[PDB]
């Protein structure tokens, strides 16, 4: 059953959490091919591991830039959590290491691209299509939350589509192991729960709100709360008002009013019955939760495959040298990485 599965998943996770893997490869073991994505303190590159011929997505973080952005603890969280978790819809961390200049997290390469790109191009997903993705997130959060993890950045940009059409969640940069409340203002404007915006202490219920935003966005093709500037978005989110498209089913709108619930005593996922209030909802009546977990449901969409190291599903970015200083930067800050 669910409880028994989660019990053993916690045993598995706790062992790795308390004794993290460290220094399991070296930069010289990989050939760098192409940038897949770029960030404030790093980038993700497609690489080939020479010893296996396997392609991987290598996230390279500049330690100096991490420190300047005050993301030291968040980055330590990211790697410590990722090396410890294990779940079908989570991107796998294969190796990690560091050098004088950078941190490196080598993850599984998912050539299908971000959901974001397929969603924008297609316009919107059908309710069944959206439901299929949403199911995988429900299970993923059920797993993460059971380990006392909050994810804190759900969005189509962080959901990769694999060769079977299933989701791989990446971007654990704000993920945190926390029992009880936390306070950091983080996330993405469109997906922030009202309590994050209003500087209250919050808990895993913010991920359930973010699920409501994702389902809305997937099914509508645009988010429930949008504007040109973040401040305007935050005003809409705290106003207590949401409008649904004409084409949204009655069930869908009812699921969404219970997820996008400003009142915590009323938000689905947070209540006495926890995730089951979501799983047993009418919108999910057709969903076979075990068959989703087992990946025996046929996906509504399978990305075009043009080879194991093809990048056609990703945009192009300006390539930039990977520089490794002859002097160690930020040794003490990242000692445990």
């Amino acid at each position: 059953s669910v409880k028994e599965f989660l019990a053993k998943a916690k045993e598995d996770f706790l062992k790795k959490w308390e004794n993290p893997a460290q220094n399991t490869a070296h930069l010289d073991q990989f050939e760098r091919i192409k940038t897949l994505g770029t960030g404030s303190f790093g980038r993700v590159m497609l690489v080939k591991h020479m010893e296996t011929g396997n392609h991987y997505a290598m996230k390279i973080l500049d330690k100096q830039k991490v420190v300047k952005l005050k993301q030291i603890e968040h980055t330590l969280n990211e790697k410590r959590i990722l090396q410890a978790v294990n779940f079908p819809f989570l991107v796998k961390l294969e190796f990690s290491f560091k050098d004088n200049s950078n941190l490196y997290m080598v993850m599984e390469y998912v050539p299908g691209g971000e959901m974001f790109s397929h969603l924008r191009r297609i316009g919107r997903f059908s309710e069944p299509h959206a439901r299929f993705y949403a199911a995988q997130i429900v299970l993923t959060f059920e797993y993460l939350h059971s380990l006392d993890l909050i994810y804190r950045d759900l969005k189509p940009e962080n959901l990769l589509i694999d060769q079977q059409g299933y989701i791989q969640v990446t971007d654990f940069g704000f993920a945190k192991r926390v029992k009880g409340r936390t306070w950091t203002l983080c996330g993405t404007p469109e997906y922030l729960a009202p309590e994050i915006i209003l500087s209250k202490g919050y808990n895993k219920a913010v991920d359930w709100w973010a699920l409501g935003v994702l389902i809305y966005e997937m099914a509508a093709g645009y988010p429930p709360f949008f504007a040109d500037q973040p401040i305007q978005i935050y005003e809409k989110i705290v106003s207590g008002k949401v409008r649904f498209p004409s084409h949204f089913s009655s069930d869908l709108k009812d699921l969404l009013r219970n997820l996008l619930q400003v009142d915590l005593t009323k938000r689905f996922g947070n209540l006495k019955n926890g995730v089951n209030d979501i799983k047993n909802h009418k919108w999910f009546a057709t969903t076979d939760w075990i068959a989703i977990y087992q990946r025996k449901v046929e996906a509504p969409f399978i990305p075009k495959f043009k080879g194991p190291g093809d990048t056609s599903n990703f945009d192009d970015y300006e390539e930039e040298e990977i520089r490794v200083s002859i002097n160690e930067k930020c040794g003490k800050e990242f000692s445990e990485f």
């Binding site: 950045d153 969005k155 971007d171 940069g173 704000f174 993405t188 404007p189 645009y222 949008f226 504007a227």
Partner: peptide
């Protein structure tokens, strides 16, 4: 339409994470 307003907005591309 709402779709049109979104498409004409400045936030239809990839959205950056924020923090304090």
């Amino acid at each position: 339409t709402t779709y049109a307003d979104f498409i004409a907005s400045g936030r239809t591309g990839r959205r950056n994470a924020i923090h304090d």
